[PDB]
Amino acid sequence: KRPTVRPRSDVTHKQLSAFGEYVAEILPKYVQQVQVSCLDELEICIHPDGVIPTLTFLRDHTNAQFKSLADLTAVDVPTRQNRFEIVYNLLSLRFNSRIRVKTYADELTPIDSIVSVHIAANWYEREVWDMFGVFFFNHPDLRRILTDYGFEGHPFRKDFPLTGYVELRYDDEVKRVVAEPVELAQEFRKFDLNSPWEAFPAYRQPPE
């Protein structure tokens, strides 16, 4: 009816909530949270040691059949104890559905790699280790995939600077491309683009 508001359907929300209850009661050992968003997307947040049983059940169950891994990524929220929230997006072609599985890690607790479940997880976990520094157990070849050779630090972490620490330039005295500490002719101008008036009252946090 409203041409500027995205139409919503409650049937998909109900089916995803029912399947969330189904998965949560099938796997109470690892499932910590089940939520369905307003955008009709299902998220199950699990303990880090249950990633292998959860992914294996979701792939090889008859009622799940999530045989395709859409992606594997990490989100750096450096205000919680386990700062890396690791996200698995999975696709079910049999039932035409999408699911999200979330887990957590910090800088010193690796989680189990799911290469034995999905082969794309090999390169995706290599990307996660290269960008965030999350180690993965039982990976066949865990190494850097996107950064330069010998690059120190994980650049997709929050505390890493945007411009980095070193740059490359060609030196004629040594006839080589060499790395120097960062100096910019024009510094990146940080913009404070945040209005001090609350935009969404539905997400108003209680005071501390």
Site for another protein, residues 118 to 157, rule: CB under 8 A: 135, 142-144, 146-151, 155
Q: Which of 69-77, 79-87, 91-99, 113-121 is the region at the interface with another protein (rule: CB under 8 A)?
A: 91-99
* Interface with another protein (CB under 8 A), residue from 29, 93, 119, 138: 93
What are the Cα distances from residue 126, in Å, to 99, 100, 114, 180?
22, 20, 12, 27
Min dist CB 185 to another protein, Å, is 5
- Token readout for 48 is 């880090």
Site string for another protein, 13-42 (x = CB under 8 A): --xxxxxxxx-x------xxxxxxxx---x
Q: Give the E-state strand segments of the chain in sequence order.
A: 31-36, 42-46, 68-76, 84-92, 97-105, 111-112, 136-137, 166-171, 176-181
Phi and psi angles of residue 112, each rounded to the nearest 5 degrees, phi first: -75, 130
For the CB of residue 187, give the shortest distance to another protein in the complex, in Å: 9
Amino acid at 163: T
CB-CB neighbours of 82 under 10 Å: 14
Q: Judged by CB under 8 A, which stretch of 67-75, 76-84, 114-122, 199-207 contacts another protein? A: 199-207
Helix axes 10-26, 51-60, angle to 10 degrees: 120
Q: Which helix (H) or strand (E) holds 109?
A: none
Using CB under 8 A, which of 140, 196, 201, 206 touches another protein?
Answer: 201
Q: Which of 181, 196, 206, 207 binds another protein (CB under 8 A)?
A: 181
The yes or no reply on residue 177 touching another protein (CB under 8 A) is yes
For the bound state, the minimum distance from the C-beta of residue 73 to another protein, rounded and expressed in Å, comes to 18
Q: How far is the CB of 12 from another protein (least distance, A)?
A: 8
